C-alpha cells in the first residue's frame, strides 16, 4: 500500500514541479464512522463473554444442545443458500 502511494506521489510530484485536503479529512471521518461502532460492538461482546466465563465455572450441559440444534439449522439454510447459488450458476452456464 505504501509503495503504490509513493509511486503515484512521484507522478504527481513530476506534475507539480485546497479542496483535496478537506475531502481527505472528510474521508478520514467516514473511515472511522463505522469503526467506532465496531469498537462498541466488540466491547458489548467483551462484556458478554466475560459474563459467560463467570458462568464458565461449571454450568448445565444443555446450552450445548441448543447450540447444536441451531447449528444444524444454520448449516441447513446455508446448504439452501449454496445449493441456490450452484443451481443459478448452472442455469447461467447452460444459457
Amino acid at each position: 500500500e505504501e509503495l503504490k502511494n509513493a509511486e503515484i506521489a512521484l507522478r504527481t510530484q513530476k506534475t507539480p514541479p485546497n479542496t483535496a485536503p478537506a475531502d481527505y479529512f472528510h474521508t478520514l471521518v467516514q473511515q472511522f464512522e463505522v469503526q467506532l461502532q465496531q469498537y462498541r460492538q466488540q466491547i458489548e461482546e467483551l462484556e458478554n463473554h466475560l459474563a459467560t466465563q463467570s458462568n464458565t465455572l461449571h454450568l448445565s450441559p444443555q446450552d450445548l444442545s441448543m447450540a447444536m440444534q441451531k447449528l444444524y439449522q444454520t448449516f441447513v439454510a446455508l446448504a439452501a443458500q449454496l445449493q441456490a447459488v450452484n443451481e443459478n450458476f448452472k442455469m447461467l452456464k447452460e444459457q
Binding site: 460492538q41 458489548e44 461482546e45 467483551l46 458478554n48 463473554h49 447450540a67
Partner: peptide, 14 residues
Amino acid sequence: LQEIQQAGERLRSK
C-alpha cells in the same frame, strides 16, 4: 474465542 464471543453475542442479540 472471539468467534465464540461473537456467537454468544449473537445469542444475546437474537
